Scaffold this active site. Sequence first.
Site, PDB file in Angstrom:
ATOM      1  CG  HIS A 114      -1.879  -1.129   1.586  1.00 55.51           C
ATOM      2  ND1 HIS A 114      -3.011  -1.199   0.443  1.00 55.51           N
ATOM      3  CD2 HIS A 114      -2.093  -1.876   2.413  1.00 55.51           C
ATOM      4  CE1 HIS A 114      -3.416  -2.545   0.880  1.00 55.51           C
ATOM      5  NE2 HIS A 114      -3.049  -2.963   1.865  1.00 55.51           N
TER       6      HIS A 114
ATOM      7  CG  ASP B 294      -1.943  10.628  -4.849  1.00 52.59           C
ATOM      8  OD1 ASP B 294      -2.015  10.391  -6.248  1.00 52.59           O
ATOM      9  OD2 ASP B 294      -1.967  11.968  -4.456  1.00 52.59           O
TER      10      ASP B 294
ATOM     11  CG  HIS C 138      -5.792  14.319  -4.605  1.00 53.37           C
ATOM     12  ND1 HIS C 138      -7.103  14.425  -5.470  1.00 53.37           N
ATOM     13  CD2 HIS C 138      -5.157  13.046  -5.026  1.00 53.37           C
ATOM     14  CE1 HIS C 138      -7.210  13.004  -6.024  1.00 53.37           C
ATOM     15  NE2 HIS C 138      -5.998  12.488  -5.852  1.00 53.37           N
TER      16      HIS C 138
ATOM     17  CG  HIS D  51      -6.525   8.121  -4.218  1.00 47.69           C
ATOM     18  ND1 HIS D  51      -5.405   7.377  -4.623  1.00 47.69           N
ATOM     19  CD2 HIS D  51      -6.809   9.096  -4.633  1.00 47.69           C
ATOM     20  CE1 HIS D  51      -5.055   7.928  -5.811  1.00 47.69           C
ATOM     21  NE2 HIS D  51      -5.695   9.101  -5.668  1.00 47.69           N
ATOM     22  CB  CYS D  52      -4.073   3.429  -1.212  1.00 54.23           C
ATOM     23  SG  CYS D  52      -2.817   1.883  -1.533  1.00 54.23           S
TER      24      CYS D  52
ATOM     25  CG  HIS E  63      -4.889  -0.905  -3.571  1.00 53.43           C
ATOM     26  ND1 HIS E  63      -4.045  -1.217  -2.368  1.00 53.43           N
ATOM     27  CD2 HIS E  63      -4.661  -1.921  -4.240  1.00 53.43           C
ATOM     28  CE1 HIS E  63      -3.326  -2.090  -2.483  1.00 53.43           C
ATOM     29  NE2 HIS E  63      -3.801  -2.665  -3.581  1.00 53.43           N
TER      30      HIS E  63
ATOM     31  CG  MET F 134      -6.393   2.300   0.971  1.00 56.39           C
ATOM     32  SD  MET F 134      -5.143   0.877   1.123  1.00 56.39           S
ATOM     33  CE  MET F 134      -3.897   1.665   2.120  1.00 56.39           C
TER      34      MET F 134
ATOM     35  CG  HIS G  63     -30.377  17.805  -2.596  1.00 58.98           C
ATOM     36  ND1 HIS G  63     -30.703  18.679  -3.526  1.00 58.98           N
ATOM     37  CD2 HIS G  63     -31.479  17.563  -2.036  1.00 58.98           C
ATOM     38  CE1 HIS G  63     -31.974  19.163  -3.121  1.00 58.98           C
ATOM     39  NE2 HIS G  63     -32.344  18.529  -2.168  1.00 58.98           N
TER      40      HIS G  63
ATOM     41  CD  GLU H 231     -31.878  22.762  -7.570  1.00 58.19           C
ATOM     42  OE1 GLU H 231     -32.783  22.286  -7.532  1.00 58.19           O
ATOM     43  OE2 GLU H 231     -31.637  23.356  -8.695  1.00 58.19           O
ATOM     44  CB  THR H 232     -28.303  19.285  -6.563  1.00 54.31           C
ATOM     45  OG1 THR H 232     -29.436  19.066  -5.824  1.00 54.31           O
ATOM     46  CG2 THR H 232     -27.414  18.246  -6.914  1.00 54.31           C
TER      47      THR H 232
ATOM     48  CG  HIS I 158     -31.098  15.050  -5.981  1.00 50.84           C
ATOM     49  ND1 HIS I 158     -31.753  14.602  -7.050  1.00 50.84           N
ATOM     50  CD2 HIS I 158     -31.722  15.593  -5.390  1.00 50.84           C
ATOM     51  CE1 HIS I 158     -32.981  14.987  -6.784  1.00 50.84           C
ATOM     52  NE2 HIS I 158     -32.972  15.614  -5.623  1.00 50.84           N
TER      53      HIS I 158
HETATM   54 CU   LIG Z   1      -5.747  10.840  -7.192  1.00 52.63          CU
HETATM   55 CU   LIG Z   2     -34.659  16.353  -4.833  1.00 50.39          CU
HETATM   56 CU   LIG Z   3      -3.920   0.218  -0.689  1.00 49.39          CU
END
Ligand SMILES: [Cu+2]
Ligand SMILES: [Cu+2]
Ligand SMILES: [Cu+]
Lengths: 336, 337, 336
Positions: free
Chosen positions: C92, C95, C97, C132-133, C142, C147, C252, C276-277, C303
């Site tokens: 494993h 990363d 971001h 994330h892995c 993964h 993960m 939402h 709203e969303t 949604h």
């Molecule tokens: Cu990434």
């Molecule tokens: Cu709705």
């Molecule tokens: Cu992993």
Amino acid sequence: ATAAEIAALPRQKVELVDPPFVHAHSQVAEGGPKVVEFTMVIEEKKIVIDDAGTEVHAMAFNGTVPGPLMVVHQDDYLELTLINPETNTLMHNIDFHAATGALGGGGLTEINPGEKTILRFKATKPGVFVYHCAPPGMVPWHVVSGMNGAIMVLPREGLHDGKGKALTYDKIYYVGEQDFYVPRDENGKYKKYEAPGDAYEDTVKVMRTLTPTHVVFNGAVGALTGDKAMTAAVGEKVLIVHSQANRDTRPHLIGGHGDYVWATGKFNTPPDVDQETWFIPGGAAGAAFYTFQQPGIYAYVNHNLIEAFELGAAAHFKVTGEWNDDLMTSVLAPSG
Amino acid sequence: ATAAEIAALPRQKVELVDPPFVHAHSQVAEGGPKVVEFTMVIEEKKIVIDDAGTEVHAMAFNGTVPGPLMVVHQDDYLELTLINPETNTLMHNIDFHAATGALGGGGLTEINPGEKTILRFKATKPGVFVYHCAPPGMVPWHVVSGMNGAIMVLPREGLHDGKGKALTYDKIYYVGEQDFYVPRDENGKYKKYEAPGDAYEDTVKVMRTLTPTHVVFNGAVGALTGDKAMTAAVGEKVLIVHSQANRDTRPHLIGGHGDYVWATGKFNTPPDVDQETWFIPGGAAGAAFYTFQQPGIYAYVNHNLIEAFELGAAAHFKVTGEWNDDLMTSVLAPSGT
Amino acid sequence: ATAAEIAALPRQKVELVDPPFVHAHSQVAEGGPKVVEFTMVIEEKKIVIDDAGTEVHAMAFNGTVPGPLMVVHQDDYLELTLINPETNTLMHNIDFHAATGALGGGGLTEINPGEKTILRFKATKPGVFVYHCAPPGMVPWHVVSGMNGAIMVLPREGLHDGKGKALTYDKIYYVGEQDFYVPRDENGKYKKYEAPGDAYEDTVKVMRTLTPTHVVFNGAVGALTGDKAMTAAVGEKVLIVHSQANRDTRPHLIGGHGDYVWATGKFNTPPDVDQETWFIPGGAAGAAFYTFQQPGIYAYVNHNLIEAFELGAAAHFKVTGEWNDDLMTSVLAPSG
Ligand SMILES: [Cu+2]
Ligand SMILES: [Cu+2]
Ligand SMILES: [Cu+]
Ligand SMILES: [Cu+2]
Ligand SMILES: [Cu+]
Ligand SMILES: [Cu+]
């Protein structure tokens, strides 16, 4: 506002019209806050969604898919009378994304066949917003049966660009986009049913693939073409309100642009400008403002072109006026 | 402008280059408006899109997937000579999302094999914009056969951030992302077809699943890797233009960012900043500006990681320069507990 | 900063908390830049993700899906000790971001079972960010095994609206959304496997359909509903951080709004308002700020309502306080 203050406000009854048209309204509010009254009857009915005679058991606010656009101004109250006639088979309700509380109104509007209800909410936020039915445990089934529409809550002073200059449209259209999930038999033919409940199990299986069989405007392939093509003229300013209650879309006016696009649908969020293709997530409405500069036929599409041109998500505009050779000209027409 | 005024403008003939490179241009416009002239010949051609040898009957502007990036400035005119050689079998045309009228030009540029046409349009709006073929009744089939690219209409004063500060790139790359829908036989192996027409019905069936078999940059799995990896250096300012004519994408530079991202592709819409992953809807182009700060290998991907690493949507950057331990350091290298 | 200046910064260990809760932090930074130290142990374990006993071989930072939210301020350093116990069977890494260089840290943190590593990076950019892995050649496997998580890099002066007014939340929740791809046998029953690797080929086949079998919050259908609903009160300001490391989502709040939404997750990008969303692309985090105005049960969903109510992507909030009839009232309750 207190109960007494609200009771003293003027009332205005509005007559709704079928999409893609929009009921009479003023862009700039006439006077102070009002209680704006609307009525819709829910109709469960078969609709034919393509030229192969494919049927959906629609669940249709005001008898249309999408339901009609309701227009109010910020800090008005929207007061809806919702009626579920005894001719229907299912319980229905309504959730306004514009509203605050009780699951957008759904918790207070559950009506069995033979019942009605009246809901009032304060339209506190300006924008275009989805509304849809949402019966607990059956929510996506009603929504993808066409039981959704939108409202517009205009700013009291009408629309403005990102620098506070007025944007005033000459025409407005409402395009409701619908994903349908129609069951097929072993030979690939779409199945028909003689009651909405009969289609439920088969439809849920298709829904769970997340792959619509049809993606349409105004309830059917080709609905907003020919006799129902939208119209404009060179020089005319048009607002196109677009909703999708369940699934993403990416509107595009072929041969045009979105000069100002409230891609999130909310008017206090400044509009994007000069857009080719905009994006409206499932569960939202958006709005685009354009001034036509060329005559002729335009297509208005979801720009997943498979969705547009294989699954049904294409409308037309027919635009009158004088061709502008500065903007575009054929220097050499197709030739040997 | 009147016909006489347009006729009086200078003409400049530009030679296109193959993606991901971009033909020479100036960020700030040199002089007043010009009529910028481009020529592209359409080629229906078999291409191989993966290491297994999977074929597509591509429909390729200028012989490449994507078609090349054309660069002009706002209020220039773009004048394209489009040629459909008699060796091709289908009618083709071109729709510029940057243009106004006649379905983006598609209504004025329908050319059968053995025909050519010249379209001129005024590039009124600054941004990156998709172009694609769109023959009525066959639109998505041409587009998902690779018949799409993009243009860039620079502001006459070059790029700026959302607050009027100049943004000047050192280099530019154009990444065209393509969704392909390749039919499979009963063994699950991709099919080959003698002729492009033979593939149509089977391809439409795959298209209707809305599930591409391949999602690739520059026309193939791994096309922008190895000796075709993009390059940069620590301190270098890079603009990455990204298009997708048919389907959404979500670009991401693994180990980097989008310092300024015109996610809608339109330069009068202020850019988002400090982006991890941006979003370009199907039918649009976007652009991201980044100053590299660390050397080494980067991957540039569509961050649906299935699309990136199973379906093909991953490119590489090779970046020279000095490692910055302030920004990142391995305090303890992988070692026994 | 000079080498001596970096070395002189205070180091502070922080104890993590399982999602959707968040560890101790201050919105406005306390003191100058620090090296904030976290430790996570990776656990490979079978988890049950639905009401039918469906299993996933989860790959879980700190034992949870999603991994926990780490909170620092801009120009702090995040110094993670990552441990891969010898009882695990896969390599494993991690990363971030938020980080710059070496594939977000992935190139520096590849740990086999029985190994650990310590990575430090400077948090130069304010926002919420996915981590994330990402083991080379097996990255999506993964990630879609759970993960992944997120961090929040607050501005040193806390959050602000687009006009520079402070936005101070009373509480924060982290909703990690996970797409799972569980193989099924020819009868449609979900398959079970002895070891993670045994499922690899079958799982990749499902992944390549781009159609998840389950889309869940906090690792399981219903994990944030019922007695595990999130809570608030009328008047309370809540920040909801939402991540999706692999696939798009459209959050939402049913009955509410996103008053301010950093839809891109980055705090130097002005928030959208009155949403709203909202939309968070796969590979990103976003954050929404809302002041509750009505009591009752809310649902918080992706949604795409099929994803929400058929595939699992629905949470609840239970909100106390006084109902506001100005905002919404039932004028006529459902009746004949
Ligand atoms: Cu990434
Ligand atoms: Cu709705
Ligand atoms: Cu992993
Ligand atoms: Cu197009
Ligand atoms: Cu309903
Ligand atoms: Cu073509």
